[PDB]
Design an enzyme around this catalytic site. Structure first.
Site, PDB file in Angstrom:
ATOM      1  CG  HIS A  57      -3.943  -2.861  -0.719  1.00 58.11           C
ATOM      2  ND1 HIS A  57      -4.576  -1.638  -0.779  1.00 58.11           N
ATOM      3  CD2 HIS A  57      -3.455  -2.970   0.539  1.00 58.11           C
ATOM      4  CE1 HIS A  57      -4.475  -1.035   0.391  1.00 58.11           C
ATOM      5  NE2 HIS A  57      -3.800  -1.822   1.209  1.00 58.11           N
TER       6      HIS A  57
ATOM      7  CE  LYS B 185      -7.055  -3.072   2.941  1.00 57.70           C
ATOM      8  NZ  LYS B 185      -6.948  -3.835   4.213  1.00 57.70           N
TER       9      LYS B 185
ATOM     10  CB  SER C 136      -0.939  -0.011   1.205  1.00 59.69           C
ATOM     11  OG  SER C 136      -1.568   1.248   1.370  1.00 59.69           O
TER      12      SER C 136
END
Ligand code: POV
Ligand code: POV
Lengths: 464, 491, 491, 464
Positions: free
Chosen positions: B295, B327, B267
């Protein structure tokens, strides 16, 4: 002697410097006992390749016997509540930790739907940035006001609460005195913090006193180190593995006498114990300030996901920056926060539900006495207690098989029971196998004596 | 391993003058912090922190005061940037409850007025599923009315429901692996399923930039941990060779297992993992692979199936595939996918299943509905539209930001865009100035990052249009002109 | 392991003054040797050694001159002591062809007269079988008339005879082991049967005082050799533990085999091996044992069966039992005894069997006759008489020598008696003075032994009577008075 | 620069000494790249015990297939001589290396018995002390006089002769050029000495020249090292593994051109080759002094145990103190020494036996030509030659089985043959399997052509 000193003083400077260098060389040589052999060897490329080839890794997962008692998961065909449907058979729930019946209140569902219409399902970020909603602060304020304390902090997962709270304060080089019959969350919290762990006997103050006095002797041994070590005592209000209460006043006296702070776990105690349902502290009347940290989870009583810790700001504020489960994970969805807030409102409105729960627990605990093969370990005030084999067999597997036969024969007669599940190779002090009985403010009288009679008949049928 | 398409990443190095200046700033802060602490100690200046109760004065002090040095002196000065409350759905536009402090950020008091329309670039939306109205919300409301808020027991005893089973089979179909298991927390997934897989006598090879959950899971197990450099395949070869050849550290014995923990997209950096190479070495040296697609499970791939689809490889090559629903799918939770024996062993010998409470029914319903929408089971074209829009947005944003002269990290495909500020004061300056222009960003400082690299992260989404991106880009360019944030020599 | 009877050995330490004086002597010899070499180099003094032929002057020099330093300067001065020819059977009394040199021992010329009646204490008779008349001589003459002088081929092809087979079965019965094999040289037995048993990747633990044949056999094989201290069981434990635990030196791998080479009686020291302890460790650590009963096969034991009979243990505990017929039985040769599979493998994969010529028929006949005499198969009591007479002689000699004030090494039971001279000149002095009194002894100097310990070895026999021992003891006492050889503080 | 040097010179002494010490400290630090980690660890007692327990040694001897061709030893029921008895069958000896028939001469037995009556059987000691008899010196003198050389030294075991002679002169750091088809004794001698070994093609001077010229290049590379390395060439007069003679004159020329001494082995050559039977040197007429060392064994021709080395005193005298087989072993029994002396006397008396042996060798070698499956490798002057498979099969074991079938069928027809035996895993250049034929001065003409006919018929019967 003196003449030699005078002669050395009269001698020049550089010569004396050289002689001192030689003296240092001699003193280095005398203590240089490292008998180095002066040899260097290395492996060849082909030898490295053959070493690579000979190595064989074990399989990632060991093969399973396929006869595991936990291999078969119970399948509930609907919500887990009173008059549930498990494995296709109609039953009455005696296994779900829903003490107050707040799971299926229309008010709680209305509040949850109201907050769902506004915010959605996901927070989409940690509390550290763009993951803090007004509902989170409102819920924290409500929890702080309910327990008559300054500050509270909420985690989005019940297990992570204490497992992140304990390592934040206890570090390497400290001393922790934890009860032997401590839940697995406390055990993993104490494993995460590399402090020294000392276990004492369950609900025995004598062993705690002995360990504290040995620590006092060790303190007298080296005061400087004893001035930089912190001492904690981690206990549960109502132990899950046993169903017995903790002797708080004696622990408070031991704390003030031996200078060791107290961490308290109120997961079962939080919503069932006390006149207004505030834990073991209200049950005993102990002042709230005598306990540094009180951990709880909203999963049992409030019927919502997540947990919380309660205490003074001086203690709570450190967790917002040191609690890993708080810093490095997404926050609780607003839906569950609103459900918890409405549950708190309902709990504050009517305090007689705790009284009726105590009534029913006492009745069922008294009624379940007199079974030949089953002993009721627990106390007459806990909603959840156990049933264990009086004369245990030679092995644990046969015991769990007998208990599961009892459980199945009970389910076939519309009584939904469950058996306590543990990690055999991980639990520090593995409890004996035991059936678990959970009491709600929703179970009527007749259902209570019917369940007692059914368990009695099945136990006599199986164990004779 | 080989790439079917080019793999281009850019990590531009810091200018020397900027390094000298940030060291100057940190030294000034340290000296003034020491003076601050001296003044507070000698009671010349009033201390605003709470104190231990008088009954426990003779108790050993709870905290070591030197550990909180940066908290009082460096963190508290710009504390107003981070814990910003919001009062609406975290869409492309969010409402922030504005707050003021008169004691220099030690205590915040809330003013009544509320900011509105702030462009959200801090929330983790990647496909725009965080909406208060839609089909997913209707399904979640239906299940909430039917089932309730949450389950009151664990999976093994009575807390297993039909919703969990159908969600698990749907996830298994989505990933492509044989079986999958679901959990109520992404952090707990790692922290409770890494100790089960490996134990004492095993080796764990962790990346240099692994998440805190992976590190905690590795530590809770008794295995030995070795850290290799970030996306440095040569280092991974060297550690694997040394581990196989030299065996255990004290007594030379073969390692029981070798586990490699990696993630899809990091990230903070924004760099996609070099999956073909690491799978190649995994097969060559007979290791095991743990892949954290937190992610990349929704952001990456032509259809949104993760890095294994973005590269085009085979999911059966990855032994363990962790993942998180928070997410992209817009609901909390987590999962692990793999072969059937792995899932059975985890079902029997995982901490979360035995001791922890299961997922909530509305949450699993929302995950099911969003996952069905992505795969086109609803029959509409909404699934592909968001996936292509996210790629268009990230390419446009990265290109325009790089042509302005900023320094950007990571691969060109990663939706996360880290801009580099490089100085301690520019962190707070950028945060406050961007808030004044109705843009919400996230700033990361020293103790998290290396000393010279302080950044601000933009998390893009498919909800962002071209107009919103243009407005944000114009404001970013203006602020970069104001603060002189363009450090790039290339452009 | 435990001893059924006491195990007493005495190694008295050197007096300090004697050490200082022997160092003085060696220093004087070294300085005069350097002067000698300088004089010889500058052609001032004529050199008596031979020289390379003029055609090979430009060739590289054959020998390095510094290697022969002690040969010219220290060895040549007292060279007359060692290579003493004899012209009779080496009985208790031997005839020595007396020789004189006028060029200081560089060249010897033989005078006509011959010494007669010299008491022999240098020959290796232990049971008195070296006789020119008897039953063994008659049997040897018969076989010589029948078979001849020697065989003209190797065992594998045509050189195997019935005599060899019956000798091997007789030896197997004598030792007590299942099978045995015979060879024509005791040196060759070790040098050709140690390389076959062990190879590359194995360990050999050799004693500090092993014979040259055992060392050469160990070197010809590729195994790693570790030397432990002389009769130091603690050192043997330490090497065994380290070898097992730490494995091979470079790459830690288990040793294929661990072989321990030991001997029954060490000729120079006279110390009997601590067999019970070494067998105990062999069994405990799963090692293999090679036992060289060259000196103890006839000298030791109530019946003359070796150290395994002297201690009373089981022959099956010793894996390989080497032995030599030269010392006790009075004929050249050697043997190895063990289990049947060992003997078959040696019969197939030993260098001596494949490439080397077999034993001579008269020699094997003499060995057969002497071995039959020892075991009482002839029916007479001659076998036990010699064995008890040797013990009486060795006890009497050692007791009387120790009561005179000399320093003696080794166990009280060993027939070999080393007296200590301690000085370089006393070696030659003792040799010449003892020869002048008609006694033949053997003197060992520096390069063989440690520097401070120079000795003279008496090898006793059953042929020696009480009168001969009394005469020798009186002469030894007189010489010790002359040379002041009594260094013992105890007596 | 100059001003700095002057300023340093004007400064005091102790200060400059301190600054120099600091300079040495800096120069030590710069090159101290040993990044020591400063850690120490050790194993526990229980871990040592478990490591002891897990280790398992291999068996001392590997299991045998029990089908070995060498498992069955031929059993001779009497002396090995002409008209022998092997395996219970009457035969005629074509396998024993008895070239001159001196084994069964009554004169040799009379001399051996005469020396047996005087000395006995055993010497009972090494040559270094009380193991030297007059017969030993007499035999050494006789061997020296027979070969027209200054000195000779006798070993009590034929194999040990060259295996102890070679390591005495060649040491670590030297160069040895040895033929490829060298006997095993030479190979073990070259293994005992740790010198560098270079092998050239059998009876090829081209490969020897190439190796010598490469050594010349290496000499030019570093003259100082080349001045302290000694070069040896080890060859056999009549090779056992092949039966071919060596090209001595070219070797002598190469020696004098390239400064490398010559070691010669005459085991087969010693008693059969030359007008008076002195070896390959007398056959070629080469002067005796051109060869440094000549090794031989008395086992083949003289029919007695032991060996000897012959040469100038400058070379021989070193072996008395460096030859391990001489220093550390008992001497040869006087019986065998007297037998060898009498054999030498008989050999000196009549030199026509060498001529008749050459006659018979030529006849049998010519007669054995024309066998379909057997090729006669060797030369027409060696008493011992070979018979090999012309078209060899796929494996060595099948070849040795076929040759052993031929040998057995020959023994059943009163022809005693043998097959050459080698150590398969030890020989450097393993020769092909081959039957061995040995010719004596005792085998009559008719026996020669009868053996030829029998071998021919058996070969055609078996190999077709
Ligand atoms: C032990 C560690 C002590 C570090 C002392 C650092 C001295 C430098 C320093 O901070 O000076 C400061 C005071 O300095 C003080 O008042 C020292 C107070 C120490 C508490 C003054 O620093 P300044 O000039 O405000 O910049
Ligand atoms: C290189 C090693 C050299 C060693 C020299 C030893 C000197 C001592 C020495 O031997 O002196 C000797 C000669 O000394 C000489 O004549 C030296 C001759 C060296 C050849 C003289 O020694 P001395 O006085 O006869 O006792």
């Amino acid at each position: 002697l003196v003449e030699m000193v005078q002669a050395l003083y009269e001698a020049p400077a550089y010569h004396l410097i050289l002689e001192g260098i030689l003296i240092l060389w001699i003193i280095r040589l005398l203590f240089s006992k490292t008998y180095k052999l002066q040899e260097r060897s290395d492996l060849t490329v082909k030898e490295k390749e053959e070493l690579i080839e000979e190595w064989q890794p074990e399989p990632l997962v060991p093969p399973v016997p396929k006869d595991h008692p936990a291999l078969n998961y119970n399948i509930v065909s609907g919500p887990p509540s009173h008059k549930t449907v498990v494995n296709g058979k109609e039953c009455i729930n005696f296994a779900s930790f829903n003490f107050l019946g707040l799971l299926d209140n229309p008010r709680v569902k209305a509040a949850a739907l109201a907050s769902l219409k506004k915010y959605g399902v996901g927070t989409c970020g940690p509390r550290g940035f763009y993951g803090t909603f007004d509902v989170h602060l409102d819920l924290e304020d409500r929890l702080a006001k309910f327990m008559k304390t300054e500050e509270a902090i909420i985690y989005s997962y019940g297990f992570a609460t204490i497992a992140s709270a304990i390592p934040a304060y206890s570090k390497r080089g400290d001393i922790v005195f934890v009860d032997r019959a401590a839940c697995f969350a406390i055990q993993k919290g104490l494993q995460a913090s590399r402090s020294d762990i000392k276990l004492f006997k369950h609900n025995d103050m004598a062993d705690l006193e002995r360990l504290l006095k040995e620590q006092e002797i060790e303190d007298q041994k080296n005061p400087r180190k004893a001035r930089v070590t912190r001492r904690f005592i981690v206990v549960e209000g109502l132990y899950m593995n046993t169903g017995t209460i903790c002797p708080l006043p004696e622990l408070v006296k031991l704390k003030y006498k031996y200078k060791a702070r107290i961490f308290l776990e109120e997961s079962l105690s939080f919503g069932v114990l006390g006149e207004h349902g505030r834990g073991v502290t209200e049950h005993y009347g102990i002042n709230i300030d005598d306990i540094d940290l009180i951990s709880a989870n909203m999963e049992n009583a409030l019927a919502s996901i997540g947990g919380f810790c309660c205490g003074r700001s001086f203690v709570i504020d450190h967790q917002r920056l040191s609690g890993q489960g708080y810093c490095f994970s997404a926050s609780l969805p607003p839906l569950l926060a609103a459900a918890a807030i409405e549950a708190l409102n309902i709990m504050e409105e009517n305090p007689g539900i705790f009284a009726v729960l105590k009534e029913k627990c006492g009745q069922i605990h008294k009624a379940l006495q007199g079974i030949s093969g089953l002993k009721v370990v627990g106390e007459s005030l806990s909603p959840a207690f156990h049933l264990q084999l009086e004369e245990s067999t030679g092995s644990r597997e046969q015991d769990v098989r007998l208990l599961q036969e009892i459980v199945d024969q009970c389910m076939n007669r519309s009584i939904a029971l469950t058996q306590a599940r543990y990690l055999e190779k991980e639990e520090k002090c593995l409890p004996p196998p035991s059936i678990r009985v959970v009491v709600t403010v929703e179970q009527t009288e007749e259902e209570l004596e019917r369940a007692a009679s059914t368990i009695k008949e099945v136990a006599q049928a199986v164990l004779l | 391993g080989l790439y079917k398409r080019p793999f281009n990443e850019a990590f531009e190095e810091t200018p020397m003058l900027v390094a000298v200046l940030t060291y100057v700033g940190y030294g000034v802060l340290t000296l003034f912090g020491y003076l601050r602490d001296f003044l507070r100690y000698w009671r010349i200046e009033k201390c605003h922190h709470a104190t231990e109760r008088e009954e426990q004065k003779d108790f050993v002090s709870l905290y070591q005061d030197f550990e909180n040095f940066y908290t009082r002196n460096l963190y508290m000065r710009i504390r107003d940037n981070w814990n910003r409350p919001i009062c609406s759905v975290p869409g492309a536009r969010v409402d922030i409850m504005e707050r003021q402090s008169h004691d220099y950020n030690w205590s915040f008091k809330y003013t009544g007025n509320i900011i509105k329309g702030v462009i959200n670039m801090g929330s983790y939306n990647y496909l725009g599923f965080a909406r208060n109205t839609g089909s997913c919300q209707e399904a979640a409301a239906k299940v909430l009315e039917e089932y309730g808020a949450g389950v009151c027991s664990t999976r093994q005893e009575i807390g297993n429901l039909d919703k969990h089973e159908e969600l698990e089979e749907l996830v298994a179909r989505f990933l492509g692996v044989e079986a999958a298991m679901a959990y109520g927390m992404g952090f707990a997934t790692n922290s409770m399923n890494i100790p089960a897989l490996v134990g004492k006598g095993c080796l764990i090879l962790s990346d240099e930039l692994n998440h805190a959950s992976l590190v905690l899971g590795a530590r809770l197990s008794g295995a030995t941990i070795r850290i290799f450099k970030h996306n440095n395949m040569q280092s991974l070869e060297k550690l694997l060779k040394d581990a196989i050849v030299y065996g255990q550290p004290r007594t030379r014995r073969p390692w029981k297992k070798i586990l490699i923990l990696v993630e899809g997209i990091y990230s903070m950096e924004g760099s996609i993992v070099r999956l073909p190479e690491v799978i190649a070495l995994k097969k060559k040296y007979k290791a095991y692979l743990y892949l954290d697609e937190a992610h990349s499970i929704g952001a990456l791939g032509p259809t949104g199936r993760g890095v294994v689809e973005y590269f085009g490889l085979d999911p059966e090559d990855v032994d363990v595939m962790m993942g998180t629903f928070t997410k992209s799918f817009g609901a909390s939770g987590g999962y692990i996918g793999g072969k059937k024996e792995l899932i059975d062993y985890l079902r029997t010998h995982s901490h979360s299943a035995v001791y922890a409470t299961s997922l909530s029914p509305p949450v699993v319903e929302q995950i099911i509905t969003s996952m069905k929408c992505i795969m086109g089971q609803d029959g509409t074209s909404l699934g592909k539209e968001c996936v292509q829009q996210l790629a268009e947005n990230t390419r446009y944003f990265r290109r325009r930001l790089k042509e302005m002269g900023f320094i950007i990290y990571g691969n060109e495909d990663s939706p996360v865009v880290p801009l580099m500020l490089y100085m301690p004061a520019k962190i707070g300056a950028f945060g406050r100035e961007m808030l004044k222009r109705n843009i919400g960003v996230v700033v990361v400082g020293f103790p998290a990052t290396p000393i010279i690299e302080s950044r601000a992260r933009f998390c893009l989404s498919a909800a962002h249009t071209k107009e919103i991106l243009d407005t944000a880009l114009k404001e970013i360019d203006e602020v970069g002109d104001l603060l002189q944030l363009k450090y790039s020599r290339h452009r």
